[PDB]
Amino acid sequence: YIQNMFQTKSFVDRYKYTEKLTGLYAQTLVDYSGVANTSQKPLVVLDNACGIGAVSSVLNHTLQDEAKKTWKLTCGDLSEGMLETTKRRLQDEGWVNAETKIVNALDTGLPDGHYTHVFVAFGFQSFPDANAALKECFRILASGGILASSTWQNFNWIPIMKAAIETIPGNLPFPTQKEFITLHNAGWDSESYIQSELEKLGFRDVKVIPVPKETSIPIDEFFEVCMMIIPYLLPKFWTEEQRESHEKDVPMVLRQYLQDTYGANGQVPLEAVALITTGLKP
Numbered sequence: 106y107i108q109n110m111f112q113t114k115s116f117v118d119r120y121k122y123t124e125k126l127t128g129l130y131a132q133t134l135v136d137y138s139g140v141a142n143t144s145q146k147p148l149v150v151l152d153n154a155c156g157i158g159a160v161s162s163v164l165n166h167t168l169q170d171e172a173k174k175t176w177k178l179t180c181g182d183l184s185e186g187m188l189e190t191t192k193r194r195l196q197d198e199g200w201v202n203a204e205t206k207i208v209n210a211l212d213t214g215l216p217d218g219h220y221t222h223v224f225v226a227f228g229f230q231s232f233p234d235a236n237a238a239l240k241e242c243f244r245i246l247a248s249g250g251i252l253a254s255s256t257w258q259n260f261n262w263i264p265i266m267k268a269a270i271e272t273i274p275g276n277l278p279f280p281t282q283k284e285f286i287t288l289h290n291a292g293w294d295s296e297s298y299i300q301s302e303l304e305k306l307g308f309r310d311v312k313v314i315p316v317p318k319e320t321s322i323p324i325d326e327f328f329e330v331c332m333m334i335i336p337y338l339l340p341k342f343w344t345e346e347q348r349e350s351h352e353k354d355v356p357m358v359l360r361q362y363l364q365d366t367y368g369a370n371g372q373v374p375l376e377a378v379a380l381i382t383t384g385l386k387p
């Protein structure tokens with residue numbers, strides 16, 4: 106009877122606000138992958154852990170019409186709710202030769218040596234076991250295929266949430282950005298770790314590039330990002346008594362902190378570094 110966070114309607118519904126954060130790097134990942142000017146043809150592409158379609162959307166806006174005539178795009182995710190949203194986007198944006206499909210990154214069910222490109226945009230730090238997913242990526246890539254991934258190194262949004270939580274009486278705990286980033290898998294916030302892991306599996310020409318981004322978003326949108334994340338952290342970081350005393354106050358505390366800090370009509374400055382990784386399957 107246990108739920109997976111990513112399958113819950115409330116999570117999926119707020120994810121459009123969170124995609125303003127992951128989406129900072131969708132163009133980066135597509136462009137760094139070389140998919141727009143590769144020799145590989147036709148293209149056979151997997152957007153693995155596609156979410157609500159950030160990478161797929163960029164692909165459909167970036168690739169030549171001629172390339173889309175012959176490609177096949179598979180938008181894969183474990184979450185039925187994520188794919189339902191992606192399906193609507195696929196229709197609304199008019200993606201060509203694209204399909205949604207349930208794909209478990211740890212056990213894809215997809216054929217050996219099938220894809221010219223596998224994209225994993227902010228998936229590896231969310232999977233139960235990143236390295237098992239990475240092995241699947243290697244398996245399903247064709248000879249000459251490219252893996253392109255984005256993972257987080259640093260960001261300011263967890264620290265902003267922490268600062269808000271620190272305005273509640275009781276000295277309540279909250280993760281550091283590093284603790285949050287490595288909740289499921291360590292290493293994917295380190296260039297050297299990633300380089301070594303891909304090379305150990307047999308990927309070649311491995312490149313891992315840290316890319317800084319800064320933008321801003323309205324306080325009301327940022328509130329939704331916080332409300333998506335914080336409820337899943339509290340059972341891990343707070344006691345039962347702390348939750349009984351303070352969990353119901355978190356939304357008010359967040360509103361007050363954001364208004365007080367950034368202004369009632371203000372914008373929250375988002376700052377991140379993601380690791381953009383590419384590797385070739387020989």
Ligand SMILES: Nc1ncnc2c1ncn2[C@@H]1O[C@H](CSCC[C@H](N)C(=O)O)[C@@H](O)[C@H]1O
Pocket residue numbers: 111112124127128153154155156157158159160181182183184187208209210211225226227228231232233
């Ligand atoms: N085992 C698994 N297999 C495939 N997807 C998984 C998964 N575990 C989690 N996910 C998916 O990983 C995604 C992480 S959020 C990143 C979504 C998207 N690529 C973007 O850049 O916005 C979610 O859509 C979640 O449902």
